[PDB]
CSV table of C-alpha atoms in Angstrom, one decimal:
chain,number,residue,atom,x,y,z
W,1414,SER,CA,12.5,3.3,27.4
W,1415,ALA,CA,14.0,6.3,25.6
W,1416,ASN,CA,15.1,3.9,22.8
W,1417,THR,CA,11.6,2.4,22.5
W,1418,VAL,CA,10.1,6.0,22.3
W,1419,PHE,CA,12.5,6.9,19.4
W,1420,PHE,CA,12.1,3.6,17.5
W,1421,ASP,CA,8.3,3.9,17.9
W,1422,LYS,CA,8.6,7.3,16.2
W,1423,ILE,CA,10.6,5.6,13.4
W,1424,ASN,CA,7.8,3.0,13.1
W,1425,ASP,CA,5.1,5.7,13.0
W,1426,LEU,CA,6.9,7.3,10.1
W,1427,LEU,CA,7.2,4.0,8.2
W,1428,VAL,CA,3.5,3.2,8.7
W,1429,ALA,CA,2.4,6.6,7.7
W,1430,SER,CA,4.6,6.5,4.6
W,1431,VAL,CA,3.5,3.2,3.1
W,1432,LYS,CA,-0.1,4.5,3.4
W,1433,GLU,CA,0.8,7.1,0.8
W,1434,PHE,CA,2.3,4.7,-1.7
W,1435,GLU,CA,0.1,3.4,-4.6
W,1436,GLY,CA,1.6,-0.1,-5.0
W,1437,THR,CA,3.3,-2.6,-2.8
W,1438,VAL,CA,6.2,-1.6,-0.6
W,1439,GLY,CA,8.4,-3.1,2.1
W,1440,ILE,CA,10.6,-0.9,4.3
W,1441,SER,CA,13.2,-2.0,6.8
W,1442,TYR,CA,15.3,0.2,9.1
W,1443,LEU,CA,18.2,-0.9,11.2
W,1444,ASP,CA,20.0,1.2,13.8
W,1445,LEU,CA,23.5,-0.1,13.5
W,1446,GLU,CA,24.7,0.9,17.0
W,1447,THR,CA,21.9,-0.7,18.9
W,1448,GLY,CA,20.8,-3.4,16.5
W,1449,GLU,CA,17.2,-2.2,16.8
W,1450,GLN,CA,15.0,-2.7,13.8
W,1451,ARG,CA,11.7,-1.5,12.5
W,1452,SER,CA,9.9,-2.8,9.4
W,1453,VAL,CA,6.7,-2.4,7.6
W,1454,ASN,CA,5.7,-5.2,5.2
W,1455,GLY,CA,9.3,-6.4,5.7
W,1456,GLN,CA,8.7,-10.0,4.7
W,1457,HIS,CA,7.0,-9.5,1.3
W,1458,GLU,CA,9.3,-10.9,-1.4
W,1459,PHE,CA,10.2,-8.8,-4.4
W,1460,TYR,CA,12.2,-9.6,-7.5
W,1461,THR,CA,15.7,-8.6,-6.6
W,1462,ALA,CA,16.6,-6.8,-9.8
W,1463,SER,CA,20.2,-5.4,-9.5
W,1464,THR,CA,20.2,-5.4,-5.7
W,1465,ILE,CA,21.5,-9.0,-6.0
W,1466,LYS,CA,24.9,-7.6,-7.3
W,1467,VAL,CA,25.8,-6.8,-3.6
W,1468,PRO,CA,25.7,-10.4,-2.3
W,1469,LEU,CA,27.2,-11.5,-5.7
W,1470,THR,CA,30.3,-9.4,-5.1
W,1471,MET,CA,30.5,-10.6,-1.5
W,1472,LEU,CA,30.5,-14.2,-2.8
W,1473,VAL,CA,33.2,-13.3,-5.3
W,1474,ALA,CA,35.3,-11.9,-2.4
W,1475,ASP,CA,34.7,-15.0,-0.3
W,1476,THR,CA,35.8,-17.1,-3.3
W,1477,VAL,CA,39.0,-15.1,-3.5
W,1478,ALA,CA,39.6,-15.6,0.2
W,1479,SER,CA,39.2,-19.4,-0.2
W,1480,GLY,CA,42.1,-19.3,-2.6
W,1481,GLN,CA,40.1,-20.5,-5.7
W,1482,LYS,CA,40.4,-17.2,-7.5
W,1483,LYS,CA,42.7,-14.2,-7.4
W,1484,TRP,CA,41.8,-10.5,-8.0
W,1485,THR,CA,44.5,-10.4,-10.8
W,1486,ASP,CA,42.9,-13.3,-12.7
W,1487,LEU,CA,41.9,-12.4,-16.2
W,1488,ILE,CA,38.3,-13.3,-16.8
W,1489,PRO,CA,37.3,-13.8,-20.5
W,1490,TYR,CA,34.4,-12.1,-22.1
W,1491,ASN,CA,32.0,-14.6,-23.8
W,1492,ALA,CA,29.9,-12.7,-26.3
W,1493,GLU,CA,27.6,-15.7,-26.7
W,1494,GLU,CA,26.9,-16.0,-23.0
W,1495,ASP,CA,27.6,-12.6,-21.3
W,1496,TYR,CA,26.3,-9.8,-23.6
W,1497,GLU,CA,23.6,-7.6,-22.0
W,1498,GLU,CA,22.7,-4.0,-22.5
W,1499,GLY,CA,21.3,-1.6,-19.9
W,1500,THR,CA,23.5,-0.2,-17.2
W,1501,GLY,CA,27.2,-0.7,-17.4
W,1502,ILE,CA,30.6,0.2,-19.0
W,1503,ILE,CA,31.6,-3.1,-20.6
W,1504,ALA,CA,28.8,-3.3,-23.2
W,1505,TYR,CA,29.8,0.0,-24.6
W,1506,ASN,CA,33.6,-0.6,-24.9
W,1507,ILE,CA,33.9,-4.4,-24.9
W,1508,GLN,CA,37.3,-5.8,-24.1
W,1509,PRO,CA,38.3,-9.5,-24.5
W,1510,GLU,CA,39.1,-10.0,-20.8
W,1511,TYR,CA,39.0,-8.1,-17.5
W,1512,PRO,CA,40.8,-8.5,-14.2
W,1513,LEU,CA,38.4,-10.0,-11.7
W,1514,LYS,CA,38.9,-6.9,-9.5
W,1515,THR,CA,37.7,-4.7,-12.3
W,1516,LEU,CA,34.5,-6.7,-12.8
W,1517,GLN,CA,33.9,-6.7,-9.0
W,1518,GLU,CA,34.1,-2.8,-9.0
W,1519,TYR,CA,32.0,-2.3,-12.2
W,1520,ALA,CA,29.2,-4.6,-11.0
W,1521,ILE,CA,28.4,-2.1,-8.2
W,1522,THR,CA,29.7,1.3,-9.3
W,1523,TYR,CA,28.1,1.1,-12.7
W,1524,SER,CA,25.6,-1.7,-12.0
W,1525,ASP,CA,27.3,-3.3,-14.9
W,1526,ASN,CA,25.2,-6.2,-16.3
W,1527,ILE,CA,28.0,-7.8,-18.3
W,1528,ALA,CA,30.2,-7.7,-15.2
W,1529,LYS,CA,27.5,-9.4,-13.3
W,1530,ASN,CA,27.2,-12.1,-16.0
W,1531,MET,CA,31.0,-12.6,-16.0
W,1532,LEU,CA,31.1,-12.9,-12.2
W,1533,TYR,CA,28.4,-15.5,-12.4
W,1534,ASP,CA,30.5,-17.4,-15.0
W,1535,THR,CA,33.5,-17.2,-12.7
W,1536,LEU,CA,31.5,-18.7,-9.8
W,1537,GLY,CA,30.3,-21.7,-11.8
W,1538,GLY,CA,27.1,-20.2,-13.1
W,1539,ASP,CA,24.1,-18.3,-11.8
W,1540,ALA,CA,22.3,-21.3,-10.3
W,1541,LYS,CA,25.3,-22.2,-8.2
W,1542,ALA,CA,26.1,-18.6,-7.2
W,1543,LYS,CA,22.5,-18.0,-6.2
W,1544,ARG,CA,22.3,-21.1,-4.2
W,1545,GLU,CA,25.5,-20.3,-2.4
W,1546,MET,CA,24.7,-16.6,-1.6
W,1547,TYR,CA,21.2,-17.3,-0.5
W,1548,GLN,CA,22.1,-20.4,1.6
W,1549,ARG,CA,25.1,-18.8,3.2
W,1550,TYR,CA,23.9,-15.2,3.8
W,1551,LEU,CA,20.2,-15.6,4.2
W,1552,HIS,CA,19.8,-19.3,5.1
W,1553,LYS,CA,17.2,-19.6,2.4
W,1554,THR,CA,16.6,-21.5,-0.7
W,1555,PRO,CA,16.5,-19.3,-3.8
W,1556,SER,CA,14.3,-19.2,-6.9
W,1557,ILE,CA,16.9,-19.4,-9.6
W,1558,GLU,CA,14.7,-18.0,-12.4
W,1559,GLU,CA,13.2,-15.2,-10.3
W,1560,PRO,CA,15.3,-14.5,-7.2
W,1561,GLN,CA,13.5,-12.5,-4.5
W,1562,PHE,CA,14.4,-10.4,-1.5
W,1563,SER,CA,12.3,-8.9,1.2
W,1564,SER,CA,13.4,-5.6,2.8
W,1565,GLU,CA,14.4,-7.7,5.9
W,1566,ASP,CA,16.5,-10.0,3.7
W,1567,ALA,CA,18.3,-6.9,2.4
W,1568,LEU,CA,19.1,-5.8,6.0
W,1569,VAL,CA,20.7,-9.2,6.8
W,1570,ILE,CA,23.0,-8.8,3.8
W,1571,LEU,CA,23.8,-5.1,4.7
W,1572,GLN,CA,24.5,-6.0,8.3
W,1573,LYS,CA,27.0,-8.7,7.3
W,1574,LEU,CA,28.8,-6.3,4.9
W,1575,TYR,CA,28.9,-3.5,7.5
W,1576,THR,CA,30.2,-5.7,10.3
W,1577,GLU,CA,32.7,-7.7,8.3
W,1578,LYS,CA,34.3,-4.9,6.3
W,1579,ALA,CA,36.2,-4.0,9.5
W,1580,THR,CA,38.5,-7.0,8.9
W,1581,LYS,CA,37.8,-7.8,5.3
W,1582,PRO,CA,39.3,-5.1,3.0
W,1583,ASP,CA,37.5,-6.6,0.0
W,1584,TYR,CA,34.2,-6.0,1.8
W,1585,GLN,CA,35.3,-2.4,2.5
W,1586,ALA,CA,36.0,-2.2,-1.3
W,1587,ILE,CA,32.4,-3.3,-2.0
W,1588,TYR,CA,31.1,-0.7,0.4
W,1589,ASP,CA,33.2,2.0,-1.2
W,1590,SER,CA,32.0,1.0,-4.6
W,1591,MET,CA,28.4,1.5,-3.2
W,1592,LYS,CA,29.4,5.0,-2.1
W,1593,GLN,CA,30.9,5.7,-5.5
W,1594,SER,CA,28.0,4.3,-7.5
W,1595,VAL,CA,27.0,6.7,-10.3
W,1596,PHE,CA,23.2,6.7,-9.9
W,1597,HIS,CA,22.5,9.8,-7.9
W,1598,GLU,CA,18.9,9.1,-7.0
W,1599,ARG,CA,16.7,7.2,-4.5
W,1600,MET,CA,18.7,6.9,-1.2
W,1601,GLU,CA,21.1,9.4,-2.6
W,1602,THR,CA,19.6,12.9,-2.1
W,1603,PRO,CA,20.9,16.4,-1.6
W,1604,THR,CA,20.7,15.6,2.1
W,1605,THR,CA,22.5,12.3,2.1
W,1606,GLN,CA,25.0,13.0,-0.7
W,1607,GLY,CA,28.5,11.8,0.1
W,1608,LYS,CA,27.2,9.9,3.1
W,1609,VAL,CA,25.4,7.0,1.5
W,1610,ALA,CA,26.5,3.6,0.4
W,1611,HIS,CA,23.6,2.1,-1.8
W,1612,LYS,CA,22.7,-0.3,-4.5
W,1613,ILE,CA,19.7,0.5,-6.6
W,1614,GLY,CA,17.6,-2.1,-8.5
W,1615,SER,CA,15.1,-1.6,-11.3
W,1616,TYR,CA,13.1,-3.9,-13.5
W,1617,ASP,CA,9.7,-2.9,-15.0
W,1618,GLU,CA,7.5,-2.2,-12.0
W,1619,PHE,CA,10.2,-3.1,-9.5
W,1620,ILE,CA,12.1,-0.1,-8.1
W,1621,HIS,CA,14.3,-0.7,-5.1
W,1622,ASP,CA,17.3,0.7,-3.1
W,1623,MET,CA,19.2,-0.6,-0.2
W,1624,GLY,CA,22.1,1.0,1.7
W,1625,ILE,CA,23.8,2.4,4.7
W,1626,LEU,CA,23.3,6.1,5.7
W,1627,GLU,CA,26.4,7.6,7.4
W,1628,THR,CA,24.6,9.7,10.0
W,1629,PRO,CA,26.6,10.2,13.2
W,1630,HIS,CA,24.7,7.1,14.5
W,1631,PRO,CA,24.6,5.2,11.2
W,1632,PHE,CA,21.6,3.2,10.0
W,1633,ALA,CA,20.8,0.6,7.3
W,1634,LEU,CA,17.8,1.0,5.1
W,1635,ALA,CA,16.0,-1.1,2.5
W,1636,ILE,CA,13.0,0.0,0.5
W,1637,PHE,CA,11.6,-2.4,-2.1
W,1638,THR,CA,8.7,-1.4,-4.2
W,1639,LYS,CA,6.4,-2.6,-7.0
W,1640,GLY,CA,4.1,-0.1,-8.6
W,1641,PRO,CA,2.9,1.4,-11.8
W,1642,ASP,CA,5.0,4.6,-11.8
W,1643,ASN,CA,8.8,4.4,-11.8
W,1644,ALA,CA,9.2,8.1,-11.1
W,1645,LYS,CA,6.8,8.0,-8.1
W,1646,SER,CA,8.6,5.0,-6.7
W,1647,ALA,CA,12.0,6.6,-6.9
W,1648,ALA,CA,10.7,9.8,-5.3
W,1649,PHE,CA,9.1,7.8,-2.5
W,1650,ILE,CA,12.4,6.2,-1.7
W,1651,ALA,CA,14.1,9.6,-1.6
W,1652,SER,CA,11.4,11.1,0.5
W,1653,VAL,CA,11.3,8.4,3.2
W,1654,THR,CA,15.1,8.3,3.2
W,1655,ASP,CA,15.3,12.0,4.0
W,1656,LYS,CA,12.6,11.8,6.7
W,1657,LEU,CA,14.4,9.0,8.4
W,1658,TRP,CA,17.7,10.9,8.1
W,1659,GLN,CA,16.2,13.9,9.8
W,1660,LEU,CA,14.9,11.8,12.7
W,1661,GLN,CA,18.1,10.0,13.1
W,1662,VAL,CA,20.1,13.2,13.3
W,1663,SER,CA,17.8,15.2,15.4
W,1664,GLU,CA,16.0,12.9,17.9
W,1665,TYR,CA,18.5,10.0,18.4
W,1666,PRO,CA,18.3,9.0,22.1
W,1667,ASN,CA,21.1,9.5,24.6
W,1668,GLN,CA,22.5,6.1,25.5
């Protein structure tokens, strides 16, 4: 009963919050210790933008585990297929090849677009990779041209990473790269700093973040938005994140 009281308070906060947002938003919260979730508009599908780099890296790790690739493998840069600007390290000091491990790191820590392209190449192309990650991790068929996630989808992916990193060091490495990511915004706030693993995503009107907040009783959170004002969208994510953090640290029910 005490749990339902607390989770109902989380729900009240989510409902109140989305009322304030000019645009479309989905929010999903997961209390990792109990498995209890609360969502508002948690099934609306949004263009993934860079959030897809998380399951991409998971798939790369799975592929290494299968024996088909090794972390030490040198992956060649293909100008004619891999070049992309925006976020990343590679574009701004291009090398002819990279260890697979390095790509894996850069795709998350620096949201590196070229790294992402080179990972898709390694996995047999983006259509194949997308089919595999969606089918295996979400039990869904993807749109290859315009892949989508709901906030609930994001929670399914985060839960898998969080559970399985206990026995999969390469998933722990992904998590750690999410903690070390260089974009100190959205779910990363003065309150959550040093205690958040997150993957931002941005494209035009799409502004997202998804992650795990390392409160004493930890929780997963996904906030996906589409709206006209990028600054407002990012500020909304940070605001809701801090409000949930405060509840989680101050009113968590005795079990």
